[PDB]
Structure 1
Amino acid sequence: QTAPEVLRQWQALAAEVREHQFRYYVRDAPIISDAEFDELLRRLEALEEQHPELRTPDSPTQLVGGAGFATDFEPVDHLERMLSLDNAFTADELAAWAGRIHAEVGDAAHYLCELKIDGVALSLVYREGRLTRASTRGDGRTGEDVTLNARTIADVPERLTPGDDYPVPEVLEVRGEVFFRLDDFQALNASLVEEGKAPFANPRNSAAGSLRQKDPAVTARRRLRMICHGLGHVEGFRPATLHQAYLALRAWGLPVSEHTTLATDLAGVRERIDYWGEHRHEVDHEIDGVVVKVDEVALQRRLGSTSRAPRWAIAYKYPPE
């Protein structure tokens, strides 16, 4: 075989082997038989026999038994800045935001209403349909690399599902929230106490702590969930509206909430706020408000963002008990 083909074959076989090492050792959830894996590793070691320049301390052949999977939280840039949200706590504040929106873009704006989860923000990047990076918010330009931890989350697919309706983008940065269900928060605290560790005081702290683990195998043992609620940088995907982008996220296998609705104007927004004020306790994870977003992407650009926040979105937060 020629040297280009040698380097091609090595990279592909090293990556396939490393992925199964991760799934077996960190996730404890292999997806091929031990017999299959053993053939893979033999072929890889054979190929490194011929070409010993390919054998590095970094090779999966040198990182056997689960070695070499540690998270170090190194800073990593978001592709597009990941801002926080301005908040509204009163009917008046929300109407004021609604008025400013109308005065700038008129009735052409409609309002996506989503449930606000009290969890830990996570930004995922997929390149050519494969997960390459996951990071915390950090300061909005730069977050901490927790890629390996996120790869253990059951709701986070490693690969996006192709479909002719919605082609897999070349690059997709998708934002979302990690959290625990209430029943799993309690069960994890019981487990922790049984081992002599302190329980967590709330499910948010518990999710953050469970995600931010130097050894991702700890994260893999915990029932972290995720729900996508936003788009950063995308290439090869130009959705006209946020609600239509959720259709593509679903088609690709990414988790989305079933409690999002599309409203026409402020009266429709107020009804969803009133409704979830009465029923949010029925959701099996923590909801602390309702995020109202202008749905039309073109109008999102026109209205822009400030240094710290989008002008086309507001979080209505409920008063704490």
Structure 2
Amino acid sequence: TAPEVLRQWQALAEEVREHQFRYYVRDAPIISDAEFDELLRRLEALEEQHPELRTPDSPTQLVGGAGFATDFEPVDHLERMLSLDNAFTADELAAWAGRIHAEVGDAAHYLCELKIDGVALSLVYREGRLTRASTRGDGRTGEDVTLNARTIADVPERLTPGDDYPVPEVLEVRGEVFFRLDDFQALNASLVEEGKAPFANPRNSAAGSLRQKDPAVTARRRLRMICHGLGHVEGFRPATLHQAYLALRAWGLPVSEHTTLATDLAGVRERIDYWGEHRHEVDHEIDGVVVKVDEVALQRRLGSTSRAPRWAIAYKYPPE
């Protein structure tokens, strides 16, 4: 309870708890087994002198690999997380553009990005450490799957600091989790080989593998992630979406290489026509193409309706 006592304990209980998590759940320690033994002794030493600090929730009382379960507790998104209106025909996308060119004039360019057919995940970083990950839920509230998301190889626990782009104080970033096709099939064979039913498609597999009461199951599966939107942010004010991606890259978040910037509708349509013909070559499932006004100020003059942003639209291919 004395101030240095409490700073010491938290910092060490946090460090050992992490390591417990990486060893047991993710089967991937980042320190030796020896170093870890130093750490846990110290925290039990320190808990010896001050028995206020041994609680049922202490890393020293969650010893094997216990205390690591997901329960999907409702958790609020910082910002709304709405779902995207859809366009299925050349006329609707044109109509969307017309409307968009009638409000924020000719200052709006269009970021074009591949729509992945996986599970939306919202992640929150507080001063460069990953604090929360949740599912969409209803847009305002989703479910806590933080432990499962911590096993996804693509999801750094901590953001990488660099000269050009300082780590925000708060960063809420949205992305899609998905399986590569070759891994979807390999997981299905492994499951059948245990007497378990296989998944009918990669989306269900990713959703199923994300939503595991026991996150060690998720850590055994080769789930992936690609960031594709920002929610609430502090200490970060990017002027465009395409430039925010550069910062995300820099901090170590996964971002797609099939994003292009288009000037006017005609550019948009070539990208849609292009990926209509070549999407089958991406190693993961592509639904369509999400067209967004790239300029953030224009993404405020245009707003969102109660259910969907007015500055973006998902063009969806017909399947077959």
What range describes the TM-score normalised by the shorter chain of this pair?
Answer: over 0.9
2:137 is paired with a residue of what secondary structure? Answer: coil
**TM-aligned CA deviation for residue 164 of structure 1:** 1.5
1:11 is paired with a residue of what secondary structure? Answer: helix
Q: Following the alignment from structure 1 to structure 2, what is the Cα–Cα distance between the partners of residues 169 and 105?
A: 29
1:234 is paired with a residue of what secondary structure? Answer: strand
**TM-aligned CA deviation for residue 223 of structure 1:** 0.3
**TM-aligned CA deviation for residue 316 of structure 1:** 0.3
**TM-aligned CA deviation for residue 102 of structure 1:** 0.3
2:103 is paired with a residue of what secondary structure? Answer: helix
**TM-aligned CA deviation for residue 217 of structure 1:** 0.1
Q: Following the alignment from structure 2 to structure 1, what is the Cα–Cα distance between the partners of residues 109 and 157?
A: 33
1:107 is paired with a residue of what secondary structure? Answer: coil
**TM-aligned CA deviation for residue 180 of structure 1:** 0.1
Q: Following the alignment from structure 1 to structure 2, what is the Cα–Cα distance between the partners of residues 35 and 221?
A: 25
Q: Following the alignment from structure 1 to structure 2, what is the Cα–Cα distance between the partners of residues 68 and 57?
A: 10
Q: Following the alignment from structure 1 to structure 2, what is the Cα–Cα distance between the partners of residues 104 and 317?
A: 24
**TM-aligned CA deviation for residue 290 of structure 1:** 0.2
Q: Following the alignment from structure 1 to structure 2, what is the Cα–Cα distance between the partners of residues 189 and 203?
A: 10
Structure 1 runs (4+) greater than 4 angstroms displaced? none
Q: Following the alignment from structure 2 to structure 1, what is the Cα–Cα distance between the partners of residues 104 and 17?
A: 51
Normalised TM-score (structure 2): 1.00
Deviations 1:197-224 (A, max 9, x none): 0000000000000000000000000000
**TM-aligned CA deviation for residue 38 of structure 1:** 0.3
**TM-aligned CA deviation for residue 254 of structure 1:** 0.2
1:222 is paired with a residue of what secondary structure? Answer: coil
Query: Could you say which residue in structure 2 is the equivalent of 1:235?
Result: 234
Deviations 1:163-191 (A, max 9, x none): 11000000000000000000000000000
Q: Following the alignment from structure 2 to structure 1, what is the Cα–Cα distance between the partners of residues 272 and 33?
A: 52
2:29 corresponds to 1:30: yes
**TM-aligned CA deviation for residue 193 of structure 1:** 0.2
Deviations 1:271-303 (A, max 9, x none): 000000000000000001000000000000000
**TM-aligned CA deviation for residue 256 of structure 1:** 0.1
Q: Following the alignment from structure 2 to structure 1, what is the Cα–Cα distance between the partners of residues 24 and 292?
A: 41
Q: Following the alignment from structure 2 to structure 1, what is the Cα–Cα distance between the partners of residues 91 and 124?
A: 38
Q: Following the alignment from structure 2 to structure 1, what is the Cα–Cα distance between the partners of residues 38 and 313?
A: 54
Normalised TM-score (structure 1): 0.99
Deviations 1:76-124 (A, max 9, x none): 0000000000000000000000000000011100000000000000000
Q: Following the alignment from structure 1 to structure 2, what is the Cα–Cα distance between the partners of residues 288 and 230?
A: 17
Q: Following the alignment from structure 2 to structure 1, what is the Cα–Cα distance between the partners of residues 287 and 25?
A: 33
Deviations 1:16-65 (A, max 9, x none): 00000000000000000010000000000000000000000000000001
- Equivalent residue runs for 1:87-236 within 5 Å: 87-236=86-235
Q: Following the alignment from structure 2 to structure 1, what is the Cα–Cα distance between the partners of residues 295 and 54?
A: 51
Deviations 1:215-249 (A, max 9, x none): 00000000000000000000000000000000000
Q: Following the alignment from structure 1 to structure 2, what is the Cα–Cα distance between the partners of residues 312 and 3?
A: 52
**TM-aligned CA deviation for residue 3 of structure 1:** 1.1
**TM-aligned CA deviation for residue 260 of structure 1:** 0.1
1:200 is paired with a residue of what secondary structure? Answer: coil
**TM-aligned CA deviation for residue 312 of structure 1:** 0.3
- CA RMSD, Structure 1 to Structure 2 (Å): 0.6
* Structure 1 gap segments, 5+ residues each: none
1:177 is paired with a residue of what secondary structure? Answer: strand
Q: Following the alignment from structure 1 to structure 2, what is the Cα–Cα distance between the partners of residues 65 and 165?
A: 42
Q: Following the alignment from structure 1 to structure 2, what is the Cα–Cα distance between the partners of residues 105 and 128?
A: 34
**TM-aligned CA deviation for residue 320 of structure 1:** 1.3
